[PDB]
Design a protein around this nucleic acid. Structure first.
Ligand code: CL
Ligand code: NA
Ligand code: NA
Ligand code: NA
Ligand code: NA
Ligand code: NA
Length: 1283
RNA sequence: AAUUUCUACUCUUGUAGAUGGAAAUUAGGUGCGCUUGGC
DNA sequence: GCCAAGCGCACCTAATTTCCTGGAGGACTG
DNA sequence: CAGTCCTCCA
């Protein structure tokens, strides 16, 4: 029966290993002498130049084809709707197949097989497409079929720089096939049209229809927005939101226009922007009138379309020009400062503002658009000035002060510019003082800016800061002058207005200078990157096979446990085999690898037999057999039956499974399969590369049930590695003459002083070449390896006479906090320029310092030029390339192991990751925040690093990365979770994110569990390098992933945190529906009673689940009724003796004590309650709307079981119901058997949703897990278990 | 405070854990500036 | 001061596709 | 023309 250790050898997994290459002997001298590195750098530069030129072909051809497309989209819309309505596997597969049909319909324009075009157009498209993804791109013929464009002399020079080297673009050809493909892939144009953009467009049509039906005036507003922007002039707004128009939204220029209909168009900074549809809808909603509420109740924002693949983005909005050099910025700005000094702008400003101390301020106006900005800059609140003006005007109203009259005043303050005197009269004399102080500050800073010289360059950050500081100062004055109203309607002071307008015009360039300087100063400087090496060989390291060593140029050696890469360049322009001679293993030398590989038999056997040019030709005019002798030890016969079998008039081929599905003719399928397999055996016995391979371990041909099973057993026999000794002198002579470039393949596990455990990747590599792996392949060495040169890129070091400081104290446990560490490091190195702090001096006797016995240099690896080697490998080589029924295999194990434990993993409000381990019946075994891992607080480090990056962006300084820190943290999390999973043999349950540290964790966890090696395991145990664990399903993409990946499950997050762990109770009410006095009264009427319990001092509020249904979330759960408790607010103590108050709530933030507040309420009302009588009828019959509102707010507070206060560290769960043993859960008791806080409660219930899935799997007769967990099924399940 | 590379380290000229590359594309985010508005 | 809808710029981050090849085939050489 | 070696098929 099933065994946890059986989750091994299930599917092949590919990885890349990376090593440094250390040149040996004269290798580096020869490489430098030959100029290979400079030549490889030039080739990479030429590629970078030539790629955008070649992409003109693809862009132009794709755009020309897409302009012809005209499809009917009704069927795709119908399949989308049916899947959304039904949400079944049947309607999902219908949509998937409909999407394929539409993608193919688009693709048929590219390849010229669409009925919607003529034969002549289709034929030219086929001729173009035939040469789009090979070296025919380079001859320029396709240019004639696309337009009148021809190549410039510089372009021809780039093209000829790849003569006899166009295979440098081989990968690029594949990247472009990914653009035009009809497959369901995100890189491709058909996918982009069918699955990204059409659903968005379809939804926009629906949004439009609902909006203009409800509010018909929106139709005219939308039409006028379209007319005002001047786009789609020939199409009515209705037609823009109808399916046929989508055929006009497939090219980028059209997509850009549509998105600008939605988003509007900006001109230069500081001028009014042209509004699009979404702004019009937003403004209509912010009017807050009756129509606003209606619009707000409907979907009210249109969805922009994604860009078309490869296409250039265009915009109608204004684009600033760019500064191009340090000297352009500094000189241009310095000229501008000089003009401002000459124009006397600052003296004029100072004189204008000084005039405000004596001129008539009733004719100086503040812009109503600026009043809240000014209030924030001058007062203590953004609304201080608005409220003051409101209060003053209220006190000036004549007669009775109506609500309407007060509203009129409020409206006026949004529509009218305010004279400065009214502001001063309304706000008081302290407003004038703040005004004076702000003006003096702004002017004084602008002054110091005009006087201070600019730096010579912008190379140092301190020089950038001078530039930014002066721009900040002039922008401040620019902002200040814009405080004053510009509208012609105001009775402006004429001389003051003309003077203010003058210096404003002179200040207008400041805004453009500000943005232009930022856009330049914040550009990232040119950086050193590694580049690919070819040594002038187009297929360098493309494969390792013995027969191609001369042409691929690459071989491998082992000597004394060290590994070497040998590169064999051309000799005087010609390839020359080195012909190393095997010798006795007694001879001193190197072991050279001999690699034999006949690639994927599914493609390679047809390529070398049935698909030969002479065979295909023969079977057009003949039915007789043809016999092949070239590279066959005895002739291989090809019959018409065999040929037809692999070349059917129409797919599928008869020996594939698809033929047995579609036809249902199993006698024929099993006949064809046996015949084709027999043919491959005939081929393999005769082809010179394979004739010596012993294939007797394969089963009789008839016994294979399908071809993939046969190839999965065949392919491991077609790959072999062995070694032969090569004499020392032959290798050293070859390096001396320059026929062999020899590099040690290096990482630090090969260092002389190495003595610890190796990296996993080193174990993969030494495992690959171990005797056991050579005898039976678990790990294959793959071709398509790559070599790189990385020029140095850094110049901080611990010099020899200095001291180093351990981060941990003498006890080797306690870390030194960051601020003390730097101070103590300076102190012990006699570089502290001040007193040691008290705490640092207290730590001083317990620090550990190290004498620098040998220089240790930060970034040392980046401070010299290096060579690198990237080499792919494949693990689990005995398995098929993809698993069959992985999840069912796991589920069979899980049904046979009903005691399997469960690891729940949650993302928390105050915890990056929180884990709870439960046994199979829900008992908590372990629970733990992972903010801190081994005394390092990654939570704090990440938060600090993000604050640094924000401050850096604001300061125009180097931002740097946070991804490397996130990955370092997550690798520690991975290590911990995997260790728990292996120790417990547990399932792991994560949040289903369809309901960033946590999402990145999910992918790394899945990926680790596709191929899990534990470096301490013996190689031959499951989990050792030659028998990796495989516990998750093969990863392909997140979008293509269900709710199960082997031992990993995904569950919805709702009702996992705000749920009582002892009962499964959740707050059933939707508080947005309890709005006003009448519904509040109905809400209280829906409870059976509220009464005081004199025995305990609690209040009990009895609720039956079938009452108050209009206020409920529609989730009755399992219990017919609940006793909601107002807990007596008494002192309790946790496990450590710390007090807390029972029943406390944290509400928006104050502490609230509901039982005590209820008592105070009842005593205020004179309502008798100590007799146990029902309180609710007394409140209801008395009908005090404030008392009733307080009652309902108290009920809402009691039902708020999660209570958090970031300032006190509180984040607890206190249930409002008692469980079957009388207990009201409170996490503040800190009972380690229950969730210790709210995030732990979330992880606990995440795990229990996994338990629900395992329980239902157990009770089912199949091996399929249920897809999804509805909220009601979850609540009924968990409440039934707990009650 | 050394690295294939990342993170955390320093008994140890190195230690612990992680690490699928390259190409191509697309999406999103942060920050700054600006527009019309809401509070 | 915060927020909504939106436009411009700077750089950072992550997801999703492909390949992980020997030898047939023929263009280019001398 | 025969040998070389870049290109790209299956
Ligand atoms: Cl929740
Ligand atoms: Na190690
Ligand atoms: Na990559
Ligand atoms: Na942005
Ligand atoms: Na604004
Ligand atoms: Na914005």
């Amino acid at each position: 029966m099933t065994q946890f250790e059986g989750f091994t050898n299930l599917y092949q997994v590919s990885k890349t290993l990376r090593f440094e290459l250390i040149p040996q002997g004269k290798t580096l001298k020869h490489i430098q002498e030959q100029g290979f590195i400079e030549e490889d750098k030039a080739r990479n530069d030429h590629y970078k130049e030539l790629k955008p030129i070649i992409d003109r072909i693809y862009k132009t051809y794709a755009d020309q084809c897409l302009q012809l497309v005209q499809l009917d989209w009704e069927n795709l819309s119908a399949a989308i709707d049916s899947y959304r309505k039904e949400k079944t596997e049947e309607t999902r597969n219908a949509l998937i197949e409909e999407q394929a049909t539409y993608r193919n319909a688009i693709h048929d324009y590219f390849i010229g097989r669409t009925d919607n075009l003529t034969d002549a157009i289709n034929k030219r498209h086929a001729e173009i497409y035939k040469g789009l993804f090979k070296a025919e791109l380079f001859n320029g013929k396709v240019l004639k079929q696309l337009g009148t464009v021809t190549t410039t002399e510089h372009e021809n020079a780039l093209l000829r720089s790849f003569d006899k080297f166009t295979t440098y673009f081989s990968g690029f050809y594949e990247n472009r096939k990914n653009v035009f493909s009809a497959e369901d892939i995100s890189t491709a144009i058909p996918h982009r049209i069918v699955q990204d953009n059409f659903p968005k467009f379809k939804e926009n049509c629906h949004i439009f229809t609902r909006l203009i039906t409800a509010v018909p005036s929106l139709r005219e507003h939308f039409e006028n927005v379209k007319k005002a922007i001047g786009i789609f002039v020939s199409t009515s707004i209705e037609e823009v939101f109808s399916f046929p128009f989508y055929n006009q939204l497939l090219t980028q220029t059209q997509i850009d226009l549509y998105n600008q209909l939605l988003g509007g168009i900006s001109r230069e900074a500081g001028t009014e922007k042209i509004k699009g549809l979404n702004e019009v809808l937003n403004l209509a909603i912010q009017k807050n009138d009756e129509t606003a509420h209606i619009i707000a109740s409907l979907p009210h924002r249109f969805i922009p379309l994604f860009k078309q693949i490869l296409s250039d983005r265009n915009t109608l909005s204004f684009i600033l020009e760019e500064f191009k050099s340090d000297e352009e910025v500094i000189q241009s700005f310095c000229k501008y400062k000089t003009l401002l000094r000459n124009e006397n702008v600052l003296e004029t400003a100072e004189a204008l503002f000084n005039e405000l101390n004596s001129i008539d301020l009733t004719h100086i106006f503040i812009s109503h658009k600026k009043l809240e900005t000014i209030s924030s800059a001058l007062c203590d609140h953004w609304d201080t000035l608005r409220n003051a003006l409101y209060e003053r005007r209220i006190s000036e109203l004549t007669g009775k002060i109506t609500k309407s009259a007060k509203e009129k005043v409020q409206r006026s303050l949004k529509h009218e510019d305010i004279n400065l005197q009214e502001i001063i009269s309304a706000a008081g004399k302290e407003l004038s003082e703040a005004f004076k102080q702000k003006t003096s500050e702004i002017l004084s800073h602008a002054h110091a800016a005009l006087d201070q010289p600019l730096p010579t360059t912008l190379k140092k950050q301190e020089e950038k800061e001078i530039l930014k500081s002066q721009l900040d100062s002039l922008l401040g004055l620019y902002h200040l002058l814009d405080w004053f109203a510009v509208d012609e309607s105001n009775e402006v002071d004429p001389e003051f207005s003309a003077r203010l307008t003058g210096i404003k015009l002179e200040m207008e360039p400041s805004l453009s200078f500000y943005n232009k300087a930022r856009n330049y100063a914040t550009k990232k400087p040119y950086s050193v990157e590694k580049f690919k090496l070819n040594f002038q060989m187009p297929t360098l390291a493309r494969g390792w096979d013995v027969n191609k060593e001369k042409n691929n140029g690459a071989i491998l050696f082992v000597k004394n446990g060290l590994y070497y890469l040998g590169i064999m360049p051309k000799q005087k322009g010609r390839y020359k085999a080195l012909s190393f001679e095997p010798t006795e293993k007694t001879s001193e030398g190197f072991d050279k690898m001999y690699y034999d590989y006949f690639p994927d038999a599914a493609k390679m056997i047809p390529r070398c037999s049935t698909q030969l040019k002479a065979v295909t030709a023969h079977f057009q005019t003949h039915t007789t057999p043809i016999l092949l002798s070239n590279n066959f030890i005895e002739p291989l016969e090809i019959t018409k039956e065999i040929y037809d079998l692999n070349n059917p008039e129409k797919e599928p081929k008869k020996f594939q499974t698809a033929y047995a599905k579609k036809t249902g003719d199993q006698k024929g399928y099993r006949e064809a399969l046996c015949k084709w397999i027999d043919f491959t055996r005939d081929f393999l016995s005769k082809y010179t590369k394979t004739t010596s391979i012993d294939l007797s371990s394969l089963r009789p041909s008839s016994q294979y049930k399908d071809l993939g099973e046969y190839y999965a057993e065949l392919n491991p026999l077609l790959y072999h590695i062995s070694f032969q000794r090569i004499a020392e002198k032959e290798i050293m002579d070859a390096v001396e003459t320059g026929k062999l470039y020899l590099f040690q393949i290096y990482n630090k596990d090969f260092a002389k002083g190495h003595h610890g455990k190796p990296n996993l990747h080193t174990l993969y590599w030494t495992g690959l070449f171990s005797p056991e792996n050579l005898a039976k392949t678990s790990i294959k060495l793959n071709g398509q390896a790559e070599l790189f040169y990385r020029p140095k890129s850094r110049m901080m070091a611990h010099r020899l006479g200095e001291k180093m400081l351990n981060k941990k104290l003498k006890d080797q446990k306690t870390p030194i906090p960051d601020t003390l560490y730097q101070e103590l490091y300076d102190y012990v190195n006699h570089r502290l320029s001040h007193d040691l702090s008290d705490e640092a001096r207290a730590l001083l006797p317990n620090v550990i310092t190290k004498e620098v016995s040998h220089e240790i240099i930060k970034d040392r690896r980046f401070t010299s030029d290096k060579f690198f080697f990237h080499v792919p490998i494949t693990l689990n080589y005995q398995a098929a390339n993809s698993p069959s029924k992985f999840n069912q295999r796991v589920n069979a194990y899980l049904k046979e192991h009903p005691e399997t434990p469960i690891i729940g993993i949650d993302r928390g409000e105050r915890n990056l990751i929180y884990i709870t381990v439960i046994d199979s019946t829900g008992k908590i075994l372990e629970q733990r925040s992972l903010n801190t891992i081994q005394q390092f607080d990654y939570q704090k480090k990440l938060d600090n690093r993000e604050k640094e990056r924000v401050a850096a962006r604001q300061a125009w300084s180097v931002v740097g990365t946070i991804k490397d820190l996130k990955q370092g943290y997550l690798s520690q999390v991975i290590h911990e979770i995997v260790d728990l999973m292996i120790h417990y043999q547990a399932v792991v349950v994560l949040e289903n994110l369809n309901f960033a540290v946590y999402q990145q964790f999910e992918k790394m966890l899945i990926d680790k569990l596709n191929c899990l090696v534990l470096k301490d395991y013996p190689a031959e145990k499951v989990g050792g390098v030659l028998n990796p664990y495989q516990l998750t399903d093969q990863f392909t993409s997140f979008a293509k992933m269900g709710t199960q990946s082997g031992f990993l499950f995904y569950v919805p997050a709702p009702y996992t945190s705000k749920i009582d762990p002892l009962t499964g109770f959740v707050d059933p009410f939707v508080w947005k529906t309890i709005k006003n006095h009448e519904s509040r009264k109905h809400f209280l009427e829906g409870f059976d009673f509220l009464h005081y319990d004199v025995k305990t001092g609690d209040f009990i509020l009895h609720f039956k689940m079938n009452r108050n249904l209009s206020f409920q979330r529609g989730l009755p759960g399992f219990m017919p009724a609940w006793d909601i408790v107002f807990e007596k607010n008494e002192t309790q103590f946790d496990a450590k003796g710390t007090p807390f108050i029972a029943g406390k709530r944290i509400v928006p933030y104050r502490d609230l004590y509901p039982a005590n507040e209820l008592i105070a309420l009842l005593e205020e009302k004179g309502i008798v309650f100590r007799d146990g009588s029902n309180i609710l009828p007394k409140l209801l019959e008395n009908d005090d709307s404030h008392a009733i509102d307080t009652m309902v707010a108290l009920i809402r507070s009691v039902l708020q079981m999660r209570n958090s206060n970031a300032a006190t560290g509180e984040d607890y769960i206190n249930s409002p119901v008692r469980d079957l043993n009388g207990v009201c859960f409170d996490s503040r008791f800190q009972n380690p058997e229950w969730p210790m806080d709210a995030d732990a409660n979330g992880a606990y219930h995440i795990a229990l949703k996994g338990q629900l899935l395992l329980n239902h799997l157990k009770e089912s007769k199949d091996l399929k897990l249920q897809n999804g967990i509805s909220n009601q099924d979850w609540l009924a399940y968990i409440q039934e278990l707990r009650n």
